[PDB]
Amino acid sequence: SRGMITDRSGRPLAVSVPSRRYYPSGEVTAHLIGFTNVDSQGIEGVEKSFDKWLTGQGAHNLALSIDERLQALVYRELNNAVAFNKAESGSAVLVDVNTGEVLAMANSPSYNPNNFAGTAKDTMRNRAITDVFEPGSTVKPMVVMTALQRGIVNENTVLNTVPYRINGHEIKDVARYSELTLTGVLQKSSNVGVSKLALAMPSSALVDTYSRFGLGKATNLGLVGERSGLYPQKQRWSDIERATFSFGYGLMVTPLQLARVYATIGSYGIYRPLSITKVDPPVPGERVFPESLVRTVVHMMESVALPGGGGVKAAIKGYRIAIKTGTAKKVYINKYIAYTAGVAPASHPRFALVVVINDPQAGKYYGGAVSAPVFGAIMGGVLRTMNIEPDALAT
Amino acid sequence: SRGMITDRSGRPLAVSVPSRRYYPSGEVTAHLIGFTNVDSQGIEGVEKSFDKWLTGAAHNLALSIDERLQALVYRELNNAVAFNKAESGSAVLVDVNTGEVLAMANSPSYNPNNFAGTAKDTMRNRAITDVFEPGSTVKPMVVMTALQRGIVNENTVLNTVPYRINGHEIKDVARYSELTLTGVLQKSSNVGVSKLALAMPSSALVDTYSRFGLGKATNLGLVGERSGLYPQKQRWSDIERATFSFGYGLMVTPLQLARVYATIGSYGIYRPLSITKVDPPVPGERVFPESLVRTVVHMMESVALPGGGGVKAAIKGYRIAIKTGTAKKVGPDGRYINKYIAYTAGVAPASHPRFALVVVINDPQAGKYYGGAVSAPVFGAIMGGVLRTMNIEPDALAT
Numbered sequence: 163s164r165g166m167i168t169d170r171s172g173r174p175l176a177v178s179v180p181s182r183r184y185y186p187s188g189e190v191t192a193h194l195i196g197f198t199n200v201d202s203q204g205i206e207g208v209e210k211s212f213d214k215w216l217t218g219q220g221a222h223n224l225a226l227s228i229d230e231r232l233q234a235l236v237y238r239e240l241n242n243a244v245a246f247n248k249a250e251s252g253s254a255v256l257v258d259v260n261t262g263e264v265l266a267m268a269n270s271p272s273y274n275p276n277n278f279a280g281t282a283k284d285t286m287r288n289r290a291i292t293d294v295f296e297p298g299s300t301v302k303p304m305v306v307m308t309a310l311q312r313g314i315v316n317e318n319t320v321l322n323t324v325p326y327r328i329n330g331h332e333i334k335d336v337a338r339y340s341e342l343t344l345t346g347v348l349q350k351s352s353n354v355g356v357s358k359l360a361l362a363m364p365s366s367a368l369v370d371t372y373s374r375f376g377l378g379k380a381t382n383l384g385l386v387g388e389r390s391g392l393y394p395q396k397q398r399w400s401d402i403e404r405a406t407f408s409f410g411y412g413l414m415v416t417p418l419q420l421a422r423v424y425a426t427i428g429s430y431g432i433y434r435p436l437s438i439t440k441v442d443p444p445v446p447g448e449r450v451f452p453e454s455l456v457r458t459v460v461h462m463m464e465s466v467a468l469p470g471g472g473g474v475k476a477a478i479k480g481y482r483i484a485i486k487t488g489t490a491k492k493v494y495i496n497k498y499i500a501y502t503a504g505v506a507p508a509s510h511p512r513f514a515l516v517v518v519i520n521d522p523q524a525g526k527y528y529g530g531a532v533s534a535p536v537f538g539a540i541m542g543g544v545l546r547t548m549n550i551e552p553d554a555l556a557t
Numbered sequence: 558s559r560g561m562i563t564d565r566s567g568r569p570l571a572v573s574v575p576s577r578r579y580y581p582s583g584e585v586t587a588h589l590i591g592f593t594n595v596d597s598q599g600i601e602g603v604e605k606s607f608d609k610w611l612t613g614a615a616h617n618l619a620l621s622i623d624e625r626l627q628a629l630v631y632r633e634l635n636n637a638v639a640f641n642k643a644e645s646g647s648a649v650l651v652d653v654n655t656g657e658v659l660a661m662a663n664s665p666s667y668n669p670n671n672f673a674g675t676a677k678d679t680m681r682n683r684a685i686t687d688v689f690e691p692g693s694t695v696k697p698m699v700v701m702t703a704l705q706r707g708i709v710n711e712n713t714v715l716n717t718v719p720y721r722i723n724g725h726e727i728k729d730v731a732r733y734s735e736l737t738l739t740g741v742l743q744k745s746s747n748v749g750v751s752k753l754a755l756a757m758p759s760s761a762l763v764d765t766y767s768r769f770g771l772g773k774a775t776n777l778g779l780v781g782e783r784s785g786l787y788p789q790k791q792r793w794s795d796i797e798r799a800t801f802s803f804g805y806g807l808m809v810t811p812l813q814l815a816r817v818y819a820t821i822g823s824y825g826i827y828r829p830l831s832i833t834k835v836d837p838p839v840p841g842e843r844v845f846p847e848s849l850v851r852t853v854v855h856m857m858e859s860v861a862l863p864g865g866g867g868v869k870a871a872i873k874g875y876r877i878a879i880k881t882g883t884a885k886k887v888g889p890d891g892r893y894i895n896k897y898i899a900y901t902a903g904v905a906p907a908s909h910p911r912f913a914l915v916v917v918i919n920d921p922q923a924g925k926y927y928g929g930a931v932s933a934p935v936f937g938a939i940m941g942g943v944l945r946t947m948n949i950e951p952d953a954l955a956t
C-alpha cells in the first residue's frame with residue numbers, strides 16, 4: 163500500500179509489486195528515487211524524504227518534476243561520457259527556467275536499485291546534491307553582469323588583457339590576448355579580463371551577485387545528504403582573493419547549485435526555488451538582477467558556442483545556445499573538474515543544463531573538450547523531445 | 558579510418574572519434590556490438606565479425622537492430638534480472654517475416670566505452686553462448702507433429718491423469734483428469750505431450766525440432782556462437798521419448814529458440830537469421846504445413862488467457878500466442894540442481910504475427926522461478942513496448 167512514485171506525466175518510477183518495490187527505470191533515476199528496506203521503509207532519495215507521505219500518513223502517490231524521457235537521454239550521454247573519459251564520476255542537472263522544476267538529475271556511476279545490496283556505498287550517494295567543487299569559469303557571466311550594473315564598463319568596452327601579477331601572483335589566460343571586448347572576455351574565458359573587472363569593484367560586489375544567483379544558499383529539495391557548498395564570508399578580501407574569485411576560486415558549489423545559477427540567467431534575473439515535485443505554473447520567483455542587463459550577458463554568452471569561443475563543440479544545428487565552459491583543478495593536484503553550463507534556446511531560454519565531469523583521465527580534461535560535446539548532445543536531445551522550434555536564422 | 562556501426566535506421570552504435578571508438582548506447586548493445594583493442598581492431602561481437610568490412614574503403618555497417626527496440630528490451634530484461642536476483646538473462650526479438658534480429662540483449666552487461674576489468678563471464682554474449690534445456694517451450698512442436706500424423710484431431714480430449722512409466726513419474730504442475738489439445742498447452746501438461754510423443758516414433762519429434770532449427774547452427778558469424786546439444790541417438794528409451802516432448806535431453810541457445818518461434822510466427826516458414834539490415838523480401842523455405850502451424854498458434858493464445866500459465870504476459874488490446882517454460886538447471890556435477898531457467902517465448906500479434914520474442918531468465922533467486930511468474934511479465938512489458946513502438950494496430954476485439 164506504498165505510494166507510487168511517477169515522473170511528471172505519470173510514468174511509474176517506483177512502484178510496489180505484490181510486497182516489493184520495483185524501479186522501472188532502474189539505474190537511470192537511481193540516485194534521485196532512492197530505495198527502501200525490507201520493511202519497505204525509505205532509506206535513500208525521494209523514497210526517504212517522502213516516506214511519511216508514501217505511507218499514506220499525510221491515494222498518496224508522488225508525481226516528480228522529472229520527465230523520464232529527458233532523464234533517460236541525460237543519463238545515456240552522461241554515463242557514457244564518464245566511461246569514455248575514464249572519469250571518477252559525472253553529474254548532469256536540467257532545470258525548467260520558467261518553473262524551477264528539476265526536469266532531470268543524473269549521475270554516473272549509478273547502480274540498479276532493483277538489487278543494490280552489492281553496490282559500493284559511495285556509488286549510492288547522489289553527487290549532484292552532495293559533491294562540491296569550485297565552479298571555475300562558470301561564474302564569469304555574473305562578473306560581467308556586476309561590472310555593467312555598476313557602470314564600471316560599457317556594453318562595447320575594450321579591456322586590456324595582457325597578463326600581470328598581484329603581489330607576485332601571476333594572472334594569466336589560457337591564450338595570450340592583448341585586448342578583448344566584453345563579449346571576448348567571455349568568449350575566450352579571460353581570467354585577466356574578469357580579474358581586472360573585479361579589482362575595480364569592492365570585494366562585496368561579486369559576493370553579492372553570486373549569492374543573489376543562489377551560490378552559498380541551500381537548494382532546499384529536502385534530500386538526504388543535500389549540501390550547500392562553502393561560500394566565502396571573509397570580512398576583508400585580499401587582492402589575490404579578490405581576483406581569483408572572479409573566476410571560480412574560493413567557493414564551492416554543487417552541480418544543483420550551478421544549475422540554479424543558470425536557470426536564473428535563463429529567466430533574465432528571476433530567481434526561482436528548485437522543485438522535484440511537478441509544479442503547476444506560474445512560479446513568480448525573485449527578480450534578483452535587472453532583466454536588460456542579464457539579457458545582454460546572455461547574448462554575449464552565445465559567443466562561447468560560436469567559432470572562436472571555447473565551447474564550440476557544444477553547438478547544436480538550428481539553435482542558439484548561451485553557455486560557459488569551466489575547468490577547475492581539484493584539491494591542488496593535476497586532476498580536473500570539466501564543466502559546461504548553459505541555457506537554450508538563447509533567443510528565449512527554456513532550459514538550464516549543467517554537465518560536470520569529475521577527474522577525466524582519457525588524455526583530455528578541459529571543459530570545452532570533455533563536457534561541451536556532452537552538453538550539446540544532451541541539450542540537442544532535450545530541444546527535440548520538447549518540440550522546441552529552431553532558433554538560428556539561416557545565413 | 559574505421560566505419561560506423563549503426564542500427565537499421567542509421568542511428569550510430571559504434572563510431573570512431575578523434576582516434577578512439579565510442580559506443581553511444583553503451584551497455585545497452587554491448588554484447589552484440591563488442592569492442593576494439595588499442596589499435597582499433599575488433600576483438601568481440603560485430604566489431605570483430607565485421608572487422609575487415611569496417612576497416613579499399615572503410616565501410617559503414619547497418620545492423621538489423623532497431624535501437625528503440627534494443628533499448629526497451631534491455632530496460633525490461635536488465636531490471637528483471639536485478640529484481641529477481643538472477644544470475645543472468647537473455648532476450649532476443651526477431652522479425653517473423655525477414656529473420657532480422659531486431660534486438661538481442663543480455664544482463665548483466667558492461668560499458669564498452671570502458672571495459673576495464675569486467676568479468677569475462679559478463680562480457681560474453683549469453684544469447685548465443687548460453688545453452689539451456691528448452692523445457693516446455695518445445696510443446697507447440699509436439700502438438701503440430703501429433704496433428705500432422707493424425708493421432709489426434711484439433712478437438713481431441715486427452716486423459717491427463719498422472720501416471721508412472723518405467724518407474725519414472727509423469728506429472729503436471731496441477732492435476733487434471735483430462736484436457737483438450739488446447740488445454741494441454743494452456744496448462745502445459747507434461748502428461749498430455751508425453752502421451753502424444755509415446756504414440757509416435759522417436760524420430761518424429763527429433764525431425765520436427767530440427768526443422769524448426771534446434772541443433773542447427775545460427776550462423777551469425779559472431780565469436781563464441783554456439784549450436785547446443787542435440788540427440789543423435791539411434792535407440793530411445795520410452796522415458797527419453799516422453800521427456801523429449803517437454804524439452805528434456807537437448808540444449809539450445811536463446812537465439813536458437815527465437816528462430817523456432819519466428820518459424821512458428823510465419824506459420825511454418827524457416828528463415829535464416831540476420832544481424833545486418835536485409836533488403837526486405839526474404840522468402841525462406843516452408844518446413845511445415847501452414848494450416849497446422851496456424852492451428853497451434855491459435856491454441857497457444859490460451860496460454861496468455863485466464864486459465865493459462867502465461868496470463869501475466871497479457872497485453873491489453875493485442876492477442877499473443879506464447880508458451881512459458883521452467884527447466885531445472887544441470888549443475889557442475891552433471892545432475893539436476895535446485896536452480897531454474899525461467900522461459901517465455903511467443904509471437905505477436907497472434908492474428909498476424911510480426912515479432913518473435915524469447916525471454917530467458919537464468920537462476921532467479923527472489924522467491925519465484927516458474928516461467929509464468931518470472932519471465933511472463935517481462936515478455937508482456939517488452940512486447941507491448943514493441944507493438945506500440947512499431948505502430949501495430951491493436952488486434953484485441955472488445956467483448
Ligand SMILES: *C(=O)[C@@H](NC(=O)/C(=N\OC1(C(=O)O)CC1)c1csc(N)n1)C(C)(C)NOS(=O)(=O)O
Pocket residue numbers: 296297298299300335336351352353409410411412472486487488489490491492498528529530
Ligand atoms: C575557467 O574555468 C578558468 N579556470 C581556472 O583558472 C582554473 N584552473 O585552470 C587550470 C587548468 O590547468 O585547467 C589550473 C590552470 C580553476 C579555477 S578554480 C579551480 N579550483 N581551478 C580557465 C582555465 C581560464 N578556463 O577554463 S575553461 O573551461 O573556460 O576553458
Ligand SMILES: *C(=O)[C@@H](NC(=O)/C(=N\OC1(C(=O)O)CC1)c1csc(N)n1)C(C)(C)NOS(=O)(=O)O
Pocket residue numbers: 690691692693694730744745746747803804805806866881882883884885886897927928929
Ligand atoms: C515445462 O517447462 C515443464 N517443465 C519441466 O517439466 C521441467 N522441469 O519442471 C520442474 C520445475 O522446475 O518445475 C522440475 C519439476 C524441465 C524440462 S527440461 C528441464 N531441464 N527441466 C513445466 C513443469 C510445465 N514448466 O512449468 S511452465 O508453466 O513454465 O510451463
